[PDB]
């Protein structure tokens with residue numbers, strides 16, 4: 284009918300947290316790749332990546348926005 | 358008549374570029390506040406903000422994607 288199953292946001296959010304847990308080193312590389320697109324260098328974004336890694340909740344929301352182009356609702 | 362998807366981006370690109378030229382420091386603050394949203398501390402996001410300022414087109418692209426949600 285009209286849809287009420289856990290939306291693309293709920294699903295992607297599930298996916299993205301499991302990746303962060305299982306292959307953090309791959310998701311770190313994803314952040315480097317995103318920031319490098321804007322001419323930023325490792326010495327500049329190295330500390331940003333390393334900060335996000337220490338903060339699983341922050342990291343999840345960052346990946347939702349910068350990788351998947353999805354905002355946290357409200 | 359027509360309202361091109363190209364035209365709206367060029368409209369939005371013009372406006373944003375004019376900001377960057379007239380009020381760069383205000384535009385820099387926009388980046389800092391988006392990064393700081395995700396618990397990245399000034400000592401960590403500062404050089405990224407400083408890196409975008411030195412690459413104006415990258416800076417512009419970064420606003421266009423992450424402030425306005427648009428792509429090329």
Ligand SMILES: [Fe+2]
Nearest residue numbers: 310313346350
């Ligand atoms: Fe990711």
Ligand SMILES: [Fe+2]
Nearest residue numbers: 384387420424
């Ligand atoms: Fe802006």
Ligand SMILES: [Zn+2]
Nearest residue numbers: 284285286287
């Ligand atoms: Zn239906």
Ligand SMILES: [Zn+2]
Nearest residue numbers: 284285286287
């Ligand atoms: Zn349907």
Ligand SMILES: [Zn+2]
Nearest residue numbers: 298299302346
């Ligand atoms: Zn993923």
Ligand SMILES: [Zn+2]
Nearest residue numbers: 302309310313
């Ligand atoms: Zn991934």
Ligand SMILES: [Zn+2]
Nearest residue numbers: 358359360361
């Ligand atoms: Zn018309």
Ligand SMILES: [Zn+2]
Nearest residue numbers: 358359360361
């Ligand atoms: Zn019209």
Ligand SMILES: [Zn+2]
Nearest residue numbers: 376383384387
């Ligand atoms: Zn602005």
